[PDB]
Amino acid sequence: SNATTDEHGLVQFSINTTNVMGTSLTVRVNYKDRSPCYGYQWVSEEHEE
Amino acid sequence: NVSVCGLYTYGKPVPGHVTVSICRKYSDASDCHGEDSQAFCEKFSGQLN
């Protein structure tokens, strides 16, 4: 599920509880990866998730 | 020391406003869709005698 950053760059949300046990939650944003110039290059914009 | 001339027949030179350069660089792994892969430059100007 996508959403947009409200004032002061922020987003609150909730999710449905019906699975196994350990629940992994990651959040990606503007530029989900670094496809152009990768593997071969030596310097890049390593932005955190 | 570096020099540049211009002739054609019987060594008759021709006069002109030369604009020589000497750009130089390191490795070539930043061009994989990455601008400014070619490192810093150097340039000169003058007239031919």
Ligand SMILES: *[C@@H]1O[C@H](CO)[C@@H](O[C@@H]2O[C@H](CO)[C@@H](O[C@@H]3O[C@H](CO[C@H]4O[C@H](CO)[C@@H](O)[C@H](O)[C@@H]4O)[C@@H](O)[C@H](O)[C@@H]3O)[C@H](O)[C@H]2NC(C)=O)[C@H](O)[C@H]1NC(C)=O
């Ligand atoms: C972020 O997530 C959003 C939701 O997954 C994406 O927005 C789009 O939201 C609409 C509606 O929920 C999806 O459906 C389209 O609707 C239009 C028009 O239908 C409208 O009218 C009926 C009336 O009965 C109403 O019930 C509907 O809810 C609508 O308001 C149709 O013409 C389309 O064919 C389509 O069915 C979109 O599918 C959805 N987009 C996507 C890509 O899933 C939003 O795009 C997401 N953000 C990004 C950046 O992708």
Ligand SMILES: *[C@@H]1O[C@H](CO)[C@@H](O[C@@H]2O[C@H](CO)[C@@H](O)[C@H](O)[C@H]2NC(C)=O)[C@H](O)[C@H]1NC(C)=O
């Ligand atoms: C080429 O560059 C050198 C300077 O780097 C000029 O000077 C000569 O330097 C050497 C040093 O071992 C001397 O033996 C020469 O005698 C110097 N030249 C003269 C004219 O005495 C050299 O002149 C430059 N040549 C040109 C054609 O510009």
Ligand SMILES: *[C@@H]1O[C@H](CO)[C@@H](O)[C@H](O)[C@H]1NC(C)=O
């Ligand atoms: C969400 O949780 C509600 C709890 O009332 C449940 O009835 C519903 O089926 C769940 N839906 C999904 C898609 O998990």
